[PDB]
Amino acid sequence: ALEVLFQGPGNNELSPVALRQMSCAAGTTQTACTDDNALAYYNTTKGGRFVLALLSDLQDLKWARFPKSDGTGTIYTELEPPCRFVTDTPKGPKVKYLYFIKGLNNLNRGMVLGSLAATVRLQ
Amino acid sequence: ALEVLFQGPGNNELSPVALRQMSCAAGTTQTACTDDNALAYYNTTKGGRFVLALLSDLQDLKWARFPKSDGTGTIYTELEPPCRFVTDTPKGPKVKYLYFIKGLNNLNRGMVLGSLAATVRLQ
C-alpha cells in the first residue's frame, strides 16, 4: 500500500520505500494517551521508527505516545494543529484529521500529502 | 491517476486534486528544445499551469519549454539536476530521470515524490 520516494541512499537516486502504518495512543495531554485511537504513519530510519503524521477521528489531539521497540521506555511526541479531510469509508463518509509531528519539515510534510492522496480520493 | 492533497482552499482542510501530465519539449539549451521528449507534471493554479517536475529518458536536460495556453508566447523554465529511478515499463526496466523545476520549494518537491511513489513501485 502507501509508498514514498526516498532521496537515497546514494547519488541522486530515488528508491520507493513503504510508508508504514501502526496503531497508537494519542490524547489531549500526555496523561490522556489511554488506548489506541489513531494511526501513525512512519518511516524506518537511521534513528529507528520515524513518525511523520497521525490520522485520527478525534480533533482534540495534541500528544501521541509510542513505546520504544526495545521496551526500555516510552516517547511522547507533540502534534501540530490537525487538518481535516473527508474520505468515503466502508461505513460511509467521515471526517479524518491529519496531525503532522510538531516541527516536521516541508519535504516530509509534502511526501505524506502526496502519498496519501490517491487513497483519500478513492471511493 | 496521479493525485496530491491541496492545502486548501480554506481553513486547514485538505482536498485531493489531480497531478496532471502533459507532453513537452526539453533540451540542453533553450534552442535545443525541439520536439516532445519529456512529461511535465503540473497543477492548475491562480497563475494558471504550474509545472512541478519533468520526467524524461534523457539525463542532459537543463531547459523545458511551454507554449502559453492563450497562444501569446512561450515560457522557458530552468530544470534542476535530475534524479534517476528504475521503473518496470511495458518494454522492460528503464531508468527515468525526474527534474524538479529550479527553485521548487520542499513542500511541492515532497508532494511529487509522494504522489509518484506507488506507480514507480508497481511492476
- Helix or strand or coil: residue B19? coil
C-alpha dist (Å) from residue B37 to B20, B51, B66: 17, 16, 12
Extract the C-alpha cell encoding A94. 467521515
Extract the C-alpha cell encoding B91. 518494454
Angstrom distance (rounded) from CA B40 to CA B64: 9
**SS3 letters for chain A?**
CCEEEEECCCCCEEEEEECEEEEEEEECCCCCCCCEEEEEEEEECCCCEEEEEEEECCCCCCEEEEECCCCCCEEEEEECCCEEEEEEECCEEEEEEEEEECCCCHHHHHHHHHHHHHHHHCC
Interior angle at CA A18, CA A89 and CA A35, nearest 5: 55
Show residues of chain A in contact with B96, CB under 8 Å: none
Interior angle at CA B91, CA B87 and CA B92, nearest 5: 45
* Helices B106-121, A106-121: inter-axial angle, 10-degree rounding: 50
Q: Classify residue A17 as exposed, middle or buried by CB count within 10 Å of its CB (0-12, 13-18, 19+).
A: middle
Residue B76: which H helix or E strand, with range?
A: strand B74-78
Determination technique for this PDB entry? Answer: X-ray
Resolution (A): 2.0
C-alpha dist (Å) from residue B13 to A33, B101, B102: 25, 26, 28
Question: Can you say whether residue B40 is alpha, beta or left, with left for phi > 0 and alpha for psi between -120 and 50 degrees?
Answer: beta
Angstrom distance (rounded) from CA B73 to CA B95: 33
Q: Which amino acid is at B23?
A: S
Contact in structure between A64 and A82 (CB atoms under 8 Å): no
Q: Classify residue A106 as exposed, middle or buried by CB count within 10 Å of its CB (0-12, 13-18, 19+).
A: middle
Residues of A at the B interface, defined by Cβ within 8 angstroms: 2-5, 7, 11-16, 19, 81-85, 98, 105-118, 120-121
Show residues of chain A in contact with B120, CB under 8 Å: 3, 5, 14, 16
CB contact under 8 A, A106 and B106: yes
Angstrom distance (rounded) from CA A53 to CA B65: 37
Residues 6+ apart with CB under 8 A from B88: B122, B123
Place of cell 529550479: B102
- Helix or strand or coil: residue B120? helix
What are the beta bridge partners of residue B41? B21, B53
Residue B106: which H helix or E strand, with range?
A: helix B106-121
Q: Which residue of B has its CA nearest to A106?
A: B107
Extract the C-alpha cell encoding B63. 531547459
CB contact under 8 A, B15 and A85: yes
Q: Which domains does chain A have, with CATH numbers?
A: 1-123 (2.40.10.250)
Cα-Cα-Cα-Cα dihedral sign, residues B27, B33, B37, B43 = positive
- Helix or strand or coil: residue B98? strand
Angstrom distance (rounded) from CA B80 to CA B77: 10
Angstrom distance (rounded) from CA A74 to CA B28: 53
- Helix or strand or coil: residue B58? coil
Angstrom distance (rounded) from CA A44 to CA A20: 8
C-alpha dist (Å) from residue B33 to B5, B39, B49, B99: 32, 13, 19, 15
